[PDB]
Amino acid sequence: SGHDQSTDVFSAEGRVFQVEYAGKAVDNSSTAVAACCKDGVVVAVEKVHTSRMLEKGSNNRIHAVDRQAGICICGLLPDGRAIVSRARQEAENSRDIFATPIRGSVLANRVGEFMHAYTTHFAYRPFGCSAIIASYADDGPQLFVSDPSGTVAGYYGVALGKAKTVAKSELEKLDFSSLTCDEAVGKLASILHEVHDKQKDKLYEVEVAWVCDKSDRKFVHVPADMVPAE
Amino acid sequence: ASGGSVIAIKYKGGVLMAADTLLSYGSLAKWPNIPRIRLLGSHSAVCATGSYADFQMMAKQVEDNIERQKMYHNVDELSPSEVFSYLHRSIYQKRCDFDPCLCQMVFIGVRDGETFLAGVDDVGTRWEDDCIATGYGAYIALPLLRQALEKNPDGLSRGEAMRILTDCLRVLFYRECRAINKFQVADAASDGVRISEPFDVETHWEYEGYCFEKTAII
Numbered sequence: 001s002g003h004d005q006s007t008d009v010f011s012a013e014g015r016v017f018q019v020e021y022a023g024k025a026v027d028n029s030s031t032a033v034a035a036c037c038k039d040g041v042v043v044a045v046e047k048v049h050t051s052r053m054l055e056k057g058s059n060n061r062i063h064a065v066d067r068q069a070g071i072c073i074c075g076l077l078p079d080g081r082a083i084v085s086r087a088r089q090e091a092e093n094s095r096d097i098f099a100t101p102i103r104g105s106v107l108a109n110r111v112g113e114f115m116h117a118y119t120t121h122f123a124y125r126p127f128g129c130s131a132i133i134a135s136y137a138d139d140g141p142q143l144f145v146s147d148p149s150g151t152v153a154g155y156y157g158v159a160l161g162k163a164k165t166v167a168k169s170e171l172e173k174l175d176f177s178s179l180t181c182d183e184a185v186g187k188l189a190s191i192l193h194e195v196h197d198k199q200k201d202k203l204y205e206v207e208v209a210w211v212c213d214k215s216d217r218k219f220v221h222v223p224a225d226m227v228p229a230e
Numbered sequence: 231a232s233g234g235s236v237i238a239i240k241y242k243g244g245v246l247m248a249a250d251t252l253l254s255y256g257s258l259a260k261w262p263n264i265p266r267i268r269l270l271g272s273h274s275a276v277c278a279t280g281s282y283a284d285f286q287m288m289a290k291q292v293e294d295n296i297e298r299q300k301m302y303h304n305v306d307e308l309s310p311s312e313v314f315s316y317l318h319r320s321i322y323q324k325r326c327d328f329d330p331c332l333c334q335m336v337f338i339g340v341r342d343g344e345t346f347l348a349g350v351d352d353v354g355t356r357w358e359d360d361c362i363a364t365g366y367g368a369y370i371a372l373p374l375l376r377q378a379l380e381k382n383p384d385g386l387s388r389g390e391a392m393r394i395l396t397d398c399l400r401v402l403f404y405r406e407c408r409a410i411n412k413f414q415v416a417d418a419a420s421d422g423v424r425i426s427e428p429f430d431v432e433t434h435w436e437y438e439g440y441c442f443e444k445t446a447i448i
Contacts (some may be wrong), residue, residue: 057304063302064301064302066301067297088298092294092298
């Protein structure tokens with residue numbers, strides 16, 4: 001009927017249909033995966049090129065938010081850009097007002113709170129992107145996920161994208177208590193190649209970033225010659 | 231609180247900026263062990279004369295801008311001349327609001343050959359030379375640096391310029407009331423700015439004309 005046209009309308013069973021439709025658009029995006037490896041975090045995203053003339057470095061989904069925290073936006077790229085800019089405004093304030101790096105959990109809480117102020121009003125539409133926040137503050141490595149519903153949750157290993165179930169069945173069998181980032185940048189990168197179907201999209205490429213002690217606790221992109229070829 | 235004087239000079243290949251490590255409260259030497267040389271980004275450095283709060287706020291505001299710009303977007307970090315330009319525009323904008331940033335700054339920087347040394351007042355005036363000096367260093371120190379430049383315009387050496395920096399710091403110690411004998415020299419070469427450990431310049435107080443009998447007004 002009309003009970004599924006605006007974000008301010010509970011269904012007959014108390015469901016906000018528009019947010020389920022929003023999450024449906026994230027369920028159809030490029031694959032991403034992430035691991036919190038007790039000494040650092042590693043996020044790795046699939047970039048599906050629609051064109052073979054695209055310069056390498058275009059449509060990079062992993063964006064730095066502070067020195068130590070980064071965001072991988074699986075879903076609609078423009079909306080992810082808005083969330084990345086809001087997280088950047090939240091992280092610069094704590095570095096300005098409170099003279100301290102923003103703790104990872106606080107950043108995830110704020111990003112979720114901002115994603116949820118768009119699913120209460122009749123004049124906005126819910127963000128069509130799920131964020132993966134990877135932070136390493138003075139509280140240890142932290143990996144959080146935010147759904148278009150605005151709900152945050154901390155993980156050890158998380159999978160997103162179109163191929164989300166089979167790519168998650170890979171993360172169950174890693175150890176995550178002895179797993180080191182230096183080998184996780186190989187493990188997750190190989191997981192994405194195993195889960196990636198190649199008779200739909202002829203052009204694809206894996207882009208991975210990490211923040212651990214080796215990078216001086218800074219969120220940077222992986223050295224180019226650290227990802228296995230295929 | 232308020233800093234002292236700053237002097238700076240360009241030699242063959244780099245810049246040198248010397249400043250005393252002391253903050254005064256009017257006539258009282260309050261804190262003699264604080265660093266007054268800040269360094270912004272990975273190519274440039276700054277040092278201010280006068281009120282410390284204003285320099286502390288302005289340097290923070292122009293150090294947040296550099297790192298964010300470089301971290302958000304995949305761009306090269308700002309050159310010395312451009313971060314100085316931003317510094318100057320922000321000082322002028324604070325002055326138009328009758329909210330002055332009451333400190334004369336000296337700004338040095340080196341990026342792959344193009345060595346840069348500028349100075350900015352608090353009213354918005356900016357300039358650039360081969361020798362800068364603020365506070366009282368503009369009167370006492372600056373003439374010595376200018377003569378040491380013109381006596382050999384080909385370009386000083388690093389040691390031959392450190393010598394004259396010591397020789398002007400000595401006079402600044404002699405003839406400036408609110409100053410102490412513990413300075414710092416930030417040296418900016420192609421690799422990048424490098425602040426030295428505090429050092430002291432030797433003095434001389436044993437002229438014969440200072441004897442008790444001679445200086446006596448009986």
